[PDB]
């Protein structure tokens, strides 16, 4: 996240950190995700597409730091990894970029609620906030496009939803953005999501609930003028989600 503030998991208790193991001894961070129900986490298919080996991923809940432990964190293995049939990537956009990870702990249980672990609400079918709404994004992604390391402390920032008409303007993304995507940016192009933030949540208040409105998907550069961040529009995948959850 470019800009934003450093935060703790108590402020985003539904945030999930997904890592990959290389038996060489190291575990590296892959993407963020969000807990939907006790046993299911939602993220982005493009985070797994290249190495769809579920046995090499570890999911942690209740984590405020990237490589150090947080008291109260929970570790799970991925029991099922459901990627979107029809996921497609082009020169920028990822289409149908949503994935579901079913989690199980070594004791065979799903997540349990605590002051650092909570589910986030899903929207109702095709129901979104109106453009202008300020939503927040969280993650361990880069703080500057030139960085080659990720922060150790979780960050968050507030961004506003913009209309498709504005995002599909030729000097923004044109038709690369579809109705199954949402664009969000800072009025002054000062904060944004960036590499390392993929799969995490775009949370907005909808009908009184803090709802998972989008999943961090792609963007040209980070915090660039006229280059909003693009998110998978969760309201449009509710049947898919239900088909599996």
């Amino acid at each position: 996240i470019i800009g934003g503030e450093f935060t703790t998991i108590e402020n985003q208790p539904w945030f999930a950190a997904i890592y990959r193991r290389h038996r060489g001894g190291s575990v590296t961070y892959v993407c963020g995700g969000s807990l939907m129900s006790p046993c299911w986490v939602i993220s982005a298919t493009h985070c797994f597409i290249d190495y769809p080996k579920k046995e090499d991923y570890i999911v942690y809940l209740g984590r405020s730091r990237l490589n150090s432990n947080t008291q109260g964190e929970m570790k799970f293995e991925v029991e099922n990894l459901i990627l979107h049939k029809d996921y497609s990537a082009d020169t920028l956009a990822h289409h149908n970029d949503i994935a579901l990870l079913k989690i199980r702990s070594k004791e065979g249980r799903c997540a349990q609620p605590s002051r650092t672990i909570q589910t986030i609400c899903l929207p109702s079918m095709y129901n979104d906030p109106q453009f202008g709404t300020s939503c927040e994004i969280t993650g361990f992604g880069k703080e500057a496009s030139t960085d080659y390391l990720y922060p150790e402390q979780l960050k968050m920032t507030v961004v506003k939803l913009i209309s498709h008409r504005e995002c599909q303007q030729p000097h923004y993304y044109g038709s690369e953005v579809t109705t199954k995507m949402l664009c969000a940016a800072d009025p002054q192009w000062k904060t944004d999501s960036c590499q390392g933030d993929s799969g995490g949540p775009l949370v907005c208040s909808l009908q009184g609930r803090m709802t998972l409105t989008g999943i961090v998907s792609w963007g040209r550069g980070c915090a660039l003028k006229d280059k909003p961040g693009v998110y998978t529009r969760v309201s449009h995948f509710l049947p898919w989600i239900r088909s599996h959850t």
């Binding site: 006790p38 609620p113 609930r209």
Partner: peptide, 13 residues
Amino acid sequence: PPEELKFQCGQKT
């Protein structure tokens, strides 16, 4: 009653 019932989506506090 079982733990799962104690999740309230979207509730931080």
